[PDB]
Design an enzyme around this catalytic site. Structure first.
Site: not given
Ligand SMILES: [K+]
Ligand SMILES: [K+]
Lengths: 127, 127
Positions: A46, A48, A63, A71, A72, A75, A112, A116
């Protein structure tokens, strides 16, 4: 091309690695990963919010979704460590900006446990 | 205030430390340093161009002057390690931008032997 970055990952374990990132303007971002010292099996991967490792990977904060208001995102997808504990993969992600107000330069990448395990600050590198 | 960053310094020695940076808009930048494991005596302290530690501190590339084109920037000034090998100082520098095209976020800080003893990538941290 037009822009490159890298993160060196380390933590409170023997996990360590390098991730390079490459993006032309605001196009797809190509991501090369090699991380070692992992337990074989699936791991989280991810973006962060903060490139702060002063208190280990907990200091990297929340995250981070670069495209939150659009306009996930953030990850990068689960990665698989092989029986040798190595995760070596190439990804193309359309939601990892190296430019703009929500650029990930100066923020963090974190691996992860599925907490962590390792983390690094995203820094600039020669184009 | 208006903006904060940090770098964690490590290298190919036992030198390690933390530097925090704080700047309001484009005003003076306040810099808090604590580095340990140094040999007592004077050390160089510089901004470098790339936040790349993939090949140690050599990968951080050239000395970086943020104000090169404006009508010693990047040299933060020599620091003194005490007999315990600790360099703990606060500086105010008017040439360390956290904003703009020549921002040091995502670049590197390096401590030099008077040669690259330790280095870290400048990352964002909560305001
Ligand atoms: K994109
Ligand atoms: K200034």
């Amino acid at each position: 091309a037009t822009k490159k970055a890298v993160a060196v990952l380390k933590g409170n374990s023997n996990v360590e690695g390098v991730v390079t990132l490459s993006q032309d303007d605001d196009g797809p971002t190509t991501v090369n990963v090699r991380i070692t010292g992992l337990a074989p099996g699936l791991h989280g991967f991810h973006l962060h919010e903060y490139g702060d490792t002063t208190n280990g990977c907990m200091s990297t904060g929340a995250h981070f979704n670069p495209n939150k208001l659009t306009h996930h995102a953030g990850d990068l997808g689960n990665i698989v460590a092989n029986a040798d504990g190595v995760a070596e993969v190439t990804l193309v992600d359309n939601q990892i900006p190296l430019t703009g107000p929500n650029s990930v330069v100066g923020r963090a990448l974190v691996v992860h446990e599925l907490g962590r395990l390792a983390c690094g600050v995203v820094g600039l590198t020669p184009i």
